[PDB]
Motif scaffolding. Structure first.
Motif, PDB file in Angstrom:
ATOM      1  N   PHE A  98      36.004  58.621  14.709  1.00  0.00           N
ATOM      2  CA  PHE A  98      36.544  59.290  14.453  1.00  0.00           C
ATOM      3  C   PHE A  98      36.178  61.100  14.816  1.00  0.00           C
ATOM      4  O   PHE A  98      36.957  61.732  15.986  1.00  0.00           O
ATOM      5  N   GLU A 119      31.733  64.336  18.360  1.00  0.00           N
ATOM      6  CA  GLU A 119      31.704  65.308  18.636  1.00  0.00           C
ATOM      7  C   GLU A 119      31.077  65.772  17.559  1.00  0.00           C
ATOM      8  O   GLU A 119      31.221  65.009  16.091  1.00  0.00           O
ATOM      9  N   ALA A 135      35.199  69.886  14.032  1.00  0.00           N
ATOM     10  CA  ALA A 135      36.319  69.173  14.187  1.00  0.00           C
ATOM     11  C   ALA A 135      37.398  69.574  12.875  1.00  0.00           C
ATOM     12  O   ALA A 135      38.268  69.944  12.818  1.00  0.00           O
ATOM     13  N   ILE A 182      38.342  73.375  13.955  1.00  0.00           N
ATOM     14  CA  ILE A 182      39.811  73.201  14.313  1.00  0.00           C
ATOM     15  C   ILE A 182      40.894  72.388  13.830  1.00  0.00           C
ATOM     16  O   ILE A 182      41.965  73.077  13.394  1.00  0.00           O
ATOM     17  N   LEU A 183      40.240  71.464  12.670  1.00  0.00           N
ATOM     18  CA  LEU A 183      41.411  70.520  12.148  1.00  0.00           C
ATOM     19  C   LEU A 183      41.771  72.519  11.419  1.00  0.00           C
ATOM     20  O   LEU A 183      43.146  71.778  10.369  1.00  0.00           O
ATOM     21  N   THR A 220      43.019  62.246  18.675  1.00  0.00           N
ATOM     22  CA  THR A 220      43.248  61.892  17.242  1.00  0.00           C
ATOM     23  C   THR A 220      43.543  63.946  17.226  1.00  0.00           C
ATOM     24  O   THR A 220      43.878  64.429  16.739  1.00  0.00           O
ATOM     25  N   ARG A 221      42.597  64.698  17.770  1.00  0.00           N
ATOM     26  CA  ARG A 221      42.643  66.491  18.112  1.00  0.00           C
ATOM     27  C   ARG A 221      44.049  66.720  18.067  1.00  0.00           C
ATOM     28  O   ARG A 221      45.027  67.621  17.339  1.00  0.00           O
ATOM     29  N   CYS A 236      47.188  65.482  16.077  1.00  0.00           N
ATOM     30  CA  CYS A 236      47.315  66.369  14.442  1.00  0.00           C
ATOM     31  C   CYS A 236      47.662  67.389  14.820  1.00  0.00           C
ATOM     32  O   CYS A 236      48.738  67.875  13.562  1.00  0.00           O
TER      33      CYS A 236
HETATM   34  C1  LIG Z   1      41.285  66.847  14.393  1.00  0.00           C
HETATM   35  C2  LIG Z   1      39.873  67.926  15.302  1.00  0.00           C
HETATM   36  C3  LIG Z   1      39.125  67.569  15.417  1.00  0.00           C
HETATM   37  C4  LIG Z   1      38.836  66.410  15.533  1.00  0.00           C
HETATM   38  N1  LIG Z   1      37.574  66.258  15.509  1.00  0.00           N
HETATM   39  C5  LIG Z   1      37.494  64.355  15.675  1.00  0.00           C
HETATM   40  C6  LIG Z   1      38.783  64.429  15.454  1.00  0.00           C
HETATM   41  C7  LIG Z   1      40.374  64.841  15.460  1.00  0.00           C
HETATM   42  C8  LIG Z   1      41.017  65.648  14.723  1.00  0.00           C
END
Ligand SMILES: c1ccc2[nH]ccc2c1
Ligand SMILES: c1ccc2[nH]ccc2c1
Lengths: 328, 346, 334
Positions: A98, A102, A107, A110-111, C71-72, C75
């Motif tokens: 995942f 990074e 992560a 950003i998410l 994944t970034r 999502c």
């Molecule tokens: C969404 C946002 C940041 C992220 N870093 C690694 C996976 C991932 C998913």
């Protein structure tokens, strides 16, 4: 807004919980617990009576599960979806594939810009804390290696308070006795519930073979919280190495998983329990509870699992609402 | 409500009957239920084709438990649920053992059924789907198992056939439909369940296969029983062939099966069988003018690409109908009640 | 109804043109379409930041086919779809070969396009996205392939840049924007596509790279073509450097790339003291050593806002493409 005795300024308590992250059960105070228990019972009755459950549309979540806990994940997904909100899942992943080298900080930085809150399960101790630092959005812990699992505590308590609602009263004459049975050293689901129950007038029976007995600092935490509400005695915390002694005069039998017997629960071992006793277990079970027990009106472990839906709905509602509340 | 224009359908009555039905075997669907599914599927076909509102079931939450990867079948159901305006939580890329992490199946479906309104379930284990159905407090829809039970594939196969040859419902001794099943009929379990269903009507089967992979005795017995029950059995009910030019003659439907290399003793044996039942525009010049070609997919070499141009080919429309049939089935089963008005219409 | 400060946008006209457009290369977005995406993205930015209703596209169902883990990016799109109030079915943790289990690509997109209203698709295969676009009965949006096409990343890179330097749209011969691309420009494919887009405007490039990893010759040719088309090409349109101190001088934008060895081009508060006052620092992320953490505190750093704008730009693009709602009224306007 009452739960028989206690009025609840659900408006006031929500203004306090708005955009709260819940990482440890210690993050939930007295008023917040009452709000979760009241709101969970609304959602229980609404769902059971097939009425509209969509009390939180307009939200998008991320369900980041970096170990497979399919029961816990699916519970939250159902909670979100039954509230009428949407969810975006990361799953079948582990810590390292995942965060493909990074940083965690980057992560969640950003998410958190993508979604309105994050449900997060990670074995890593350190990681959930790092996310909580970096996230611009509430985080709800679905479990970590620190044995923090607030939702499991909250739903364990909700189950217990549904059969013995005098636990809230903190009345010196209305005391609840519980027996924790099995691997109390490693059953981290025990440590968290204990922390919470000791806030009330409760008497614990730790039933274990020595090697897997409840850890010293849980007993210290229990003793602290009993002493704070003047409910500590010689008889607050008792220990046993067998059921016949331990299961005597206890309102709740909370069975744990026992890996690597005297701690198998049968209809035999349940003959000399109180008439009102309820049996809990976080699940999955294996040999801990014999199937014959499911017939027993004393068994509630499956209703417990079910309440997980209503408690996670409650918690998401109280935290993420931009308030009309659920009732009747 | 009217299908063909012959058959009236008390879609109210039939829903009260289907409400919270699990569908595991095609045998769980009776005559009235089939008519309801076929009517409702054609409503959803016309509604979606005309870009109209499809949200006939909005307040439901499902679980899509797929313990073997079937991306076409899964995605179909996901689309079905989402187009109806309901929501779904998926379990996938998982297998039998890493999903039931030594948890009993009984326990897992007992708990999961308390979370959702229904479960779509694909598992290779036959044992397991049955165990889920016993333990679940909620309807289950089988998306396939090792017993070759796949009612949605039957239902959508039938819907496709009835769209080109709607006299199949009439059970009229003079309006008989002949079908050719082609390839690995031993292992094409999509054949066994369609056969079970077709034999309930006036149908004539041509099993087209090479010794090792011929239709199993079971199916033939089941077909014979069901033809005898509606007085449509003759010595010309069930015919067998070891080549197309004989088998594809005077048939309304050609249902081609998958022929996986993985089922021979070598890749000699393989291309001998692959190549002898490969469908070309050549092999299709001796078929009826009205003939339609079905295939559950994926195709590989079973049907040559040139055939896609051919008005006879409908395998892609078949796949498409899967969406409309699973929407129908979910609607009929999970709706909270019927009202006259709230049913889909065009 | 609809301005970018100074430029009007017939968002009705432009949508009837974009309706059911696939977006595979940034070249699939023209001038009017870029203005529509920039306008619509800024509406969604303001609507989301002010906690107002974002559901401008309910009724749609998408498929998110991701045959490599990004994944970034995945999502981002999921959130884009869900915040618009549409639904998505995901295929993921799969690769090219275990998804198309010896099924033809053509067959798979032929079938899946009959289930959904549009498809978001990431595949390392060059060949495959093109094959899907041929076979699909429904618009496709490329979330990235091995040909270094990533239009959404270009569009969001541009949206970020236009938010700090909105004179880039003016194509005004006196208001020119200079950008420094830093690191692995050979393999930073995010550079090639942004360059293609920026060169449509009055822009001056500084490619800052070693020997092995300099910007490839055909990007320089493509940039030069597009600069020549709007009479903005000079000897000093495209400059090259071996080091930051020279390259980062007098540049409005520093776009840092990943430099994966498998030292010299690391951004610090030290190396940023000789940059303009107004300079903004971009990076597609993940970073590693490329940008030192201390820089995040620096008002000049915007790499996180860039990642965030991905949500507003993908919402814009999905809205503009998949809406069936005519009325001038039903567009977002705040
Ligand atoms: C969404 C946002 C940041 C992220 N870093 C690694 C996976 C991932 C998913
Ligand atoms: C929901 C409930 C119980 C379960 N046991 C294993 C998976 C799973 C999902």
């Amino acid at each position: 807004y009452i739960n028989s005795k206690y009025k609840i300024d659900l408006d006031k308590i929500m203004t306090k919980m708005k955009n709260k992250s819940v990482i440890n059960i210690d993050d939930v105070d007295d008023e917040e617990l009452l709000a979760i228990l009241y709101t969970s019972k609304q959602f229980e009755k609404i769902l059971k009576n097939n009425e509209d459950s969509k009390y939180l549309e307009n939200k998008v979540f991320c369900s980041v599960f970096l170990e497979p806990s399919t029961r816990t994940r699916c519970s939250f997904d159902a909670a979100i979806l039954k509230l009428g909100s949407k969810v975006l899942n990361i799953t079948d992943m582990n810590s390292t594939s995942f965060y493909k080298g990074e940083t965690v900080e980057d992560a969640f930085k950003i998410l958190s810009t993508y979604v309105d809150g994050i449900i997060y399960r990670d074995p890593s101790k350190k990681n959930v804390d790092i996310a909580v630092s970096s996230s611009s959005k509430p985080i709800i812990n679905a479990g970590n290696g620190t044995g923090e699992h607030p939702t499991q505590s909250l739903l364990d308590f909700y189950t217990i308070h549904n059969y013995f609602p005098f636990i809230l009263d903190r009345n010196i004459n209305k005391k609840l006795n519980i027996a924790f049975v099995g691997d109390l050293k490693n059953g981290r689901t025990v440590h968290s519930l204990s922390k919470l129950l000791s806030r009330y007038n409760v008497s614990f029976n730790f039933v274990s073979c020595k090697s897997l007995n409840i850890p010293k600092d849980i007993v210290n935490t229990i003793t602290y919280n009993l002493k704070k509400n003047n409910f500590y005695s010689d008889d607050s915390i008792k220990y046993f190495d067998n059921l016949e002694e331990g299961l005597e005069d206890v309102h709740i039998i909370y069975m744990t998983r026992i890996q690597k017997n005297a701690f198998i629960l049968s209809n035999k071992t349940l003959e000399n329990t109180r008439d009102d006793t309820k049996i809990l277990h976080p699940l999955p079970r294996v040999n801990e509870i014999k199937v014959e027990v499911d017939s027993n009106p004393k068994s509630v472990y499956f209703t417990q699992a079910e309440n997980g839906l209503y408690v996670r709905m409650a918690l998401l509602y109280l935290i993420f609402s931009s308030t009309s509340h659920p009732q009747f």
